[PDB]
């Protein structure tokens, strides 16, 4: 029964003629159940030392997984970030960008300025909903994200920091090709 899954991840051996190595930095499981609709880890790095050929093994550490489709190797290179994470943090997270906001109406009902006041943002009410005046930045590059500030952007005001679905390298029927 762990018989069964030693045998399973060595189960689908070679199968194909060209491939693509990828990374799983901050990507959903719903975000994966998407890509598999289009058809077109260390228990494996010894699989190759076993069934040998290739010397492609120095490319693996971090959260890595694998794809296969033999069609034009850039015809698939476009469903890559066809997914577009733009994950708005979990409940508060780290600062990978430089924060800012500008004026405009927000179309939200004026009962949510509760968050606004918690960050020293001047606000007024017009046309019925929350317009913002005199826009400012929350705090500097690489600094604090309060549950206040996150709680504001994260779900109130869709304005995230993208955590894309990337890809590192590829073997083109015998040797490997860095980028596009």
């Amino acid at each position: 029964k762990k018989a069964e899954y030693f045998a399973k991840l060595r189960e689908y051996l070679e199968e194909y003629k060209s491939l693509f190595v990828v990374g799983v930095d901050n990507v959903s499981s719903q975000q994966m159940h998407e890509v598999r609709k289009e058809l077109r880890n260390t228990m494996v790095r010894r699989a190759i030392r076993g069934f040998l050929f290739e010397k492609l093994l120095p490319f693996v550490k971090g959260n890595v997984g694998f794809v296969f489709t033999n069609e034009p190797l850039t015809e698939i290179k476009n469903v890559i970030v066809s997914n577009r994470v733009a994950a708005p943090a979990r409940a508060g997270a780290v600062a990978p960008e430089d924060i800012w906001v500008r004026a405009v109406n927000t179309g939200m009902e004026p009962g949510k300025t509760s968050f606004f006041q918690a960050l020293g943002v001047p606000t007024k009410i017009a046309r019925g909903t929350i317009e913002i005046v005199s826009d400012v930045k929350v705090v500097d590059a690489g600094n604090k994200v309060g549950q206040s500030e996150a709680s504001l952007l994260n779900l109130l005001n869709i304005s995230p920091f993208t955590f894309g679905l990337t890809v590192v390298q590829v073997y083109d029927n015998g040797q490997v090709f860095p980028s596009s």
């Binding site: 004026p110 020293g120 019925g128």
Partner: protein, 842 residues
């Protein structure tokens, strides 16, 4: 600052456009009844000297030493202005002297009755807001209460002296809190303000916000500062007074204005608000609290000081109190925002008319109200009734919207129940004296136009709480003016000595008059109950009773609760009692009534004075019930009219018509005081199976049928699994979403269950309704308040009766421990007579 004249104020009541009918509004210890003090100085009344703490609209002696306004006392004031200021009125105006009709108001939730009373007779509102405490929970509720009758608000952010000293605040954050406040104040407006104005939002640059500390004596607004300093830079006011609020700065060494934070290439520039509207004031705190006196004068002189015969020999913090009151005196900021931005009676009655009219909202008088017409038939609402200063006799306090009112004038008073058609709350007597009011001294005036608030001595024999008196035959009333607190906390009042009772029953009548929603009534259980809106509100109402209205010693007690004796079985045996005269016998069983149909007479569909053949027909079909057993009914009970009935089920029996007299007699002695504990009963039917009457007559009187029957039915009661019906309230509360969880948390500890959970659109403001057993309901409202942070406003009414699956007859159970003590207190014994007595086993 000099007091002017009784009939001089009478003369400007004619110039309606210069009248300001408004109130003050804030959360409890926010500074308003001291704020008012600073204005009646600028009308003579109070000494400008150490008379800024004996707050005058706190007329009451307990209002004065508890330091909280209790009743919404009132005062009208005469005021001077300068022509330079009286141009900026976008409503027709007349001269340079105005009359402010104000109500300083209590701001506890228990007293929201006094503020809704204060608003209904006013057009404007001045909301006070502590800087430190900001906008607390009651501010939001009394803001809702103003827009509820469409009042225009203007704000003043107060006790900013707390901001400087206790909070060691810098300049920008202090501004930032001002920003933080005004933002949250307008989000209240954009939800409840009537979507008929829009212009009712509040912003400081538009001159609808002030800043100060009414205790220390001073206030300002950006407009009062706009002119004051635009007179030297020679530049304008309009675009200038936009540059002082918000992100717009100046940057000296560059000498031209800015747009956004602008940074000035490192360490940015401060808002016009900071170095140019507060750099004066902060230096006063810093350079006189830190005692820099050698700096004090020539810094005093840089910014236009003046001293006194004692104030120069008076340095910091008693200095700051004394210098800044002279720097930016209070009324100047206030009169500005009140005369400029608050609606005169004519500019206000025209949109509050149609909604404030009981009859057709275009009635011939509502016309003359919109016009603020002082010549129509007199049209006036009395909102409160205020103690006389003699023994218990009440001016009536309202505002008139049409015609005039003269001392000695015949008038029809139309109470809350009147319609123009027939005999209703219509008394037709005259007014002894019209009189306009101050800090309880009133000044008799003989004639008063429309659009002003006044008193009225000569009535209150004819009013009970509120009323609307007119001069036209068919002038409809005014809408009934419901407040957000309903009379929920309640106790029973008995008089300590046995004979003061007459003084106690007039006191309740006199008490009902005083507070707009104190209730007093006789209960089914036979008590005088005095109900209020909070455990605190009830305190004062009884203080006012034990001393003034009743003036006798009386002690209070939780009210006794009315149960009913009922059945839920069909006689675990049959039943037979005999007589003293052991010659006659009755046989019967007793069964429960479908609670559906016991209602059917409680709602008056089956009655004794009516006739059967219809009694029979109705009950048979739909009521899981018989057709001929609904013909041979004999009587109701108790009181001849109650929901416990009898019918005949016996064979060719001896002499039933000459005891039908005496069987209903005993039936009535059993239905208002039965077994378990002698309360009235409901929902049990009794059917008679055989009867053995003696012969002759005198061996069958009432004296032998009624002692058997009352005996012979109690027997049939305890057989049929006796149960008691506890009374249940239907309670509705309006609560915001935030603390809505505190409602369900109390409802189950107090054994409630919700019927409907719903929200008002846009509002948070849910309104949950539930069934509350009154047994588990005492102190409930006060504990719901703490469970909600005061953000809940319950409103209870009786709904129905309910049995209990806990068992009554056992004293251990939590439905028999209730009537455990019901006997001991009532004066009875330990257990309740077993069915073995009342049943002659033979």
């Amino acid at each position: 600052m000099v007091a002017f004249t009784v009939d001089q104020m009478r003369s400007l009541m004619d110039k309606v456009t210069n009248v300001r009918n408004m109130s003050v509004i804030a959360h409890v210890d926010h500074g308003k009844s001291t704020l008012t003090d600073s204005l009646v100085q600028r009308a003579g009344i109070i000494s400008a000297a150490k008379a800024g703490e004996a707050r005058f609209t706190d007329t009451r002696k307990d209002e004065q030493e508890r330091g909280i306004t209790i009743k919404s006392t009132a005062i009208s004031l005469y005021s001077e202005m300068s022509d330079e200021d009286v141009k900026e009125i976008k409503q027709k105006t007349d001269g340079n002297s105005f009359l402010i009709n104000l109500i300083d108001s209590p701001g506890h939730v228990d007293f929201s009755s006094e503020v809704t009373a204060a608003l209904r007779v006013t057009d404007g509102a001045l909301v006070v807001v502590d800087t430190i405490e900001g906008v607390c929970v009651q501010t939001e509720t009394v803001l809702r209460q103003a827009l509820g009758e469409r009042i225009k608000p203007v704000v003043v952010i107060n006790k900013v002296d707390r901001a400087l000293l206790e909070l060691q605040v810098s300049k920008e954050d202090l501004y930032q809190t001002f920003a933080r406040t005004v933002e949250s104040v307008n989000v209240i407006v954009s939800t409840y303000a009537d979507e008929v104005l829009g212009d009712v939002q509040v912003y400081p640059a538009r001159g609808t916000v002030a800043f100060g500390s009414g205790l220390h004596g001073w206030a300002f607004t950006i407009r009062q500062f706009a002119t004051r300093y635009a007179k030297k830079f020679g530049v304008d006011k309009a675009k200038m007074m936009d540059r002082l609020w918000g992100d717009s700065f100046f940057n000296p060494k560059t000498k031209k204005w800015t747009n956004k934070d602008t940074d000035a290439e490192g360490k940015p520039l401060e808002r016009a608000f900071n170095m140019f509207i507060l750099d004066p004031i902060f230096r006063l705190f810093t350079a006189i609290m830190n005692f820099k006196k050698d700096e004090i004068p020539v810094l005093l002189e840089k910014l236009e000081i003046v001293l006194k015969g004692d104030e120069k020999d008076l340095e910091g913090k008693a200095l700051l109190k004394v210098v800044m009151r002279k720097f930016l005196p209070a009324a100047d900021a206030l009169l500005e925002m009140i005369v400029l931005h608050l609606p005169s009676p004519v500019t206000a009655q025209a949109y509050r008319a149609e909604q404030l009219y009981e009859g057709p909202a275009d009635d011939a008088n509502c016309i003359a109200i919109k016009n603020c017409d002082p010549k129509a038939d007199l049209m006036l609402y009395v909102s409160k009734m205020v103690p006389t200063s003699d023994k218990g006799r009440f001016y009536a306090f309202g505002r008139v919207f049409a015609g005039t009112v003269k001392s000695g004038q015949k008038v029809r008073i139309q109470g809350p129940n009147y319609v123009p058609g027939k005999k209703d709350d219509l008394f037709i007597k005259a007014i002894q004296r019209v009189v306009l009011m101050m800090g309880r001294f009133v000044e008799p005036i003989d004639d008063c136009p429309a659009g002003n608030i006044i008193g009225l001595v000569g009535i209150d024999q004819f009013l009970l709480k509120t009323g609307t008196l007119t001069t036209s035959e068919t002038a409809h009333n005014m809408k009934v003016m419901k407040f957000s607190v309903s009379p929920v906390v309640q106790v029973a009042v008995e008089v300590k000595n046995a004979n003061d009772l007459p003084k106690l029953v007039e006191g309740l009548k006199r008490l009902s008059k005083s507070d707009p929603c104190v209730l007093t009534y006789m209960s089914e259980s036979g008590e005088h109950i005095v109900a209020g809106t909070g455990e605190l509100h009830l305190e004062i109402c009884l203080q006012d009773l034990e001393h003034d209205h009743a003036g006798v010693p009386l002690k209070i007690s939780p009210p006794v609760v009315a149960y009913r004796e009922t059945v839920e079985s069909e006689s675990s045996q049959t039943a037979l009692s005999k007589s003293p005269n052991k010659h006659n016998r009755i046989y019967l069983k007793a069964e429960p009534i479908d609670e559906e149909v016991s209602l059917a007479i409680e709602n008056g569909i089956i009655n004794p004075r009516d006739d059967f053949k219809a009694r029979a027909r109705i009950m048979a079909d739909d009521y899981g019930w018989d057709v001929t057993d609904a013909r041979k009914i004999w009587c109701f009970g108790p009181d001849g009219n109650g929901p416990n009935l009898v019918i005949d089920q016996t064979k060719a029996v001896q002499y039933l018509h000459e005891i039908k007299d005496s069987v209903v007699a005993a039936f009535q002695w059993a239905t208002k005081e039965g077994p378990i504990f002698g309360e009235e009963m409901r929902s049990v039917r009794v059917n008679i199976l055989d009867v053995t009457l003696h012969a002759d007559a005198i061996h069958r009187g009432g004296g032998q049928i009624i002692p058997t029957m009352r005996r012979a039915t109690y027997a049939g009661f305890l057989l049929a699994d006796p149960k008691i019906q506890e009374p249940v309230f239907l309670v509705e509360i309006q609560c915001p979403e935030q603390a809505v969880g505190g409602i369900y948390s109390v409802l189950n500890k107090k054994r409630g269950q919700v019927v409907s959970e719903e929200q008002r659109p846009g509002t948070p403001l849910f309104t949950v309704k539930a069934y509350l057993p009154v047994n588990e309901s005492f102190g409930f409202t006060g504990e719901l308040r703490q469970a909600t942070g005061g953000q809940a406003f319950p409103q209870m009414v009786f709904d129905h009766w309910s049995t209990l699956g806990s068992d009554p007859l056992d004293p251990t159970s939590k439905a028999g421990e209730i009537v455990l003590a019901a006997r001991k207190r009532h004066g009875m014994k330990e257990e309740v007579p077993g069915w073995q007595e009342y049943y002659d086993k033979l």
